[PDB]
Symmetry: C3
Subunit: 150 residues, 3 copies
């Protein structure tokens, strides 16, 4: 099984930035009613997609007391709960984060270690890459992710 997911968020100056579950020191951060963690959301959508379960907006509406105000890792762990209850064994996740700043290079080990811990995947099964937007989307963070299971 395969799943494909995307997420993007507007970045504004002076707001905290959350990526792969971690607070990343930054001059910019998500402008959103969620934590804006685009890695988390895209991976979450990919996992749900792999089982045709819907998407994060359908399954994690903030109108719902269980998810409102919560950080995005909660949604990802619920998604993995759901797909595991359906027999899933997650094998791999490969994703690309697109943002002009900050540079994620300095945080690469922590970021990957986070994804590995949260999805209980060995680090060679976590493929994380970073790109700038080259001026195409200077004010956003974008994430696109593929997951493989079974």
């Amino acid at each position: 099984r395969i799943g494909y997911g995307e997420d993007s968020h507007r970045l504004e100056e002076g707001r905290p930035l959350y990526l792969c579950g971690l607070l990343i020191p930054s001059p910019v951060g998500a402008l959103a009613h969620s934590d804006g963690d685009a890695a988390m959301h895209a991976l979450t959508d990919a996992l749900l997609s792999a089982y045709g379960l819907g998407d994060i907006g359908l399954l994690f509406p903030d109108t719902d007391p269980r998810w409102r105000g919560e950080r995005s890792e909660v949604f990802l762990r619920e998604a993995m709960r759901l797909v595991e209850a359906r027999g899933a064994k997650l094998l791999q996740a490969s994703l690309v984060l697109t943002l002009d700043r900050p540079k994620l290079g300095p945080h690469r080990k922590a970021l990957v270690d986070s994804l590995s811990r949260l999805m209980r995947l060995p680090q060679d099964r976590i493929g994380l890459t970073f790109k700038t937007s080259e001026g195409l989307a200077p004010s956003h963070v974008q994430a696109r992710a593929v997951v493989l299971l079974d």
Copy 2:
């Protein structure tokens, strides 16, 4: 086998919106020489891609009287006829549609049913998710798709 495909169309007020082979009531719809069904186009290219067969511009150009003016489902079914003839068995389709409006949530069931029917896949093998552009592409519909075969 795997294939990856993309498509996008400009959206204009008062044009019909076609997605996943359906008419979706909308204030905006594709401006294009096709029906602008981004979902079908992406899926069609992903299928063709999985066998190296080309892209929809190569195989279904509107200078070819067979294809000009045809709905995009026609192209999708021909792409599966072509891969099937080369031995493929489609297994899974996971795709993301990005558009600010209209909301596709209230049409999710219809949309997933349509893909399921057109591709002859069980609904747990149709992974459809929806995103807004968060202001990046407010006048476009975008689609990105992965397919899995055998």
Copy 3:
């Protein structure tokens, strides 16, 4: 195993265009430190990502002599050496190039042939499709790629 990668470059007039390892006749070429070959960069990142090896800015800084002024095929072949050393057997590459001009259709045979030879894959395992940006990115080339191994 699977991997996903992306790349983009600004395009300027009076600049050579390299794609899929080839110089393409074009009125615009990448504005970039590298040769700006978005297809090769995306494919390289996808390969690296399939083994959790990092990304092209991590493995190929210009600060390392080995890589300075080097054409992108050197990066791609380094990344296949690395996954090959880990027992990988590349099975397929499927990627989408997005750019308004120049038209890539007239060069489809050459482009696919180049990828086939560089990655040592049969042509039906090279899935290449082309898209315009429909107005969204008129001065950039973008590339998004999935690789499948074993």
